[PDB]
Swiss-Prot record:
This protein's UniProt keywords: Differentiation, Hydrolase, Lipid degradation, Lipid metabolism, Meiosis, Membrane, Mitochondrion, Mitochondrion outer membrane, Oogenesis, Transmembrane, Transmembrane helix
One GO CC term, this protein: cytoplasmic side of mitochondrial outer membrane
Name of the protein this chain belongs to: Mitochondrial cardiolipin hydrolase
Organism expressing this protein natively: Drosophila melanogaster (Fruit fly)
Ranges per topology, Cytoplasmic: 4-151
Gene encoding the protein: zuc
Gene Ontology molecular-function annotations: cardiolipin hydrolase activity; identical protein binding; RNA endonuclease activity, producing 5'-phosphomonoesters
Active-site residues (renumbered): H84, K86, D91
Length: 151
């Protein structure tokens, strides 16, 4: 239970350093530490999207409603949302590039894609956490995120 504290700390820190975008796919979202980092990211101008489960979104105590009220778009598949892992994409290449077109930015702040992944908890735990900056893995996660976002 100590590694989960260390891992969450590293994840919050990664979210704090998000420049343009955060795409999060999670089964249950109860971590106050994660939810607050998303808050600070949103206040920092970062565009954030969240994909979760319809039933778990209204469970106790979910942080989804608190984030959705701040203007964070949340989409849930129906039904239900079964995943093999929860993941977070920070400044994914394709996602940042599409933001470039949306805001029509003349200049780009330097950044790079970071993928955080871990085991799904069905019942604030981040077990089997991996943090890496490989675009090969990034593009795959982004593609999966794009798919669920459509549906
Ligand atoms: Cl989860």
């Amino acid at each position: 239970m100590e590694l989960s504290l260390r891992n969450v700390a590293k994840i919050v820190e990664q979210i704090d350093r998000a420049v343009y975008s955060i795409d999060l796919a999670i089964y249950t979202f109860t971590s106050l530490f994660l939810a607050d980092s998303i808050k600070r990211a949103l206040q920092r101008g970062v565009i954030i999207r969240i994909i979760s489960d319809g039933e778990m979104v209204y469970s106790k105590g979910s942080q989804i409603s608190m984030l959705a009220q701040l203007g964070v778009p949340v989409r849930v598949p129906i039904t239900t949302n079964l995943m093999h892992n929860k993941f977070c994409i920070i400044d994914g290449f394709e996602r940042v590039e599409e933001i470039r077109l949306l805001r029509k930015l003349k200049f780009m702040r330097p950044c790079y894609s970071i993928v955080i992944s871990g085991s799904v908890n069905w019942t604030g735990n981040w077990e089997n956490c991996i943090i890496t900056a490989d675009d090969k893995l990034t593009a795959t996660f982004q593609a999966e995120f794009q798919r669920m976002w459509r549906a």
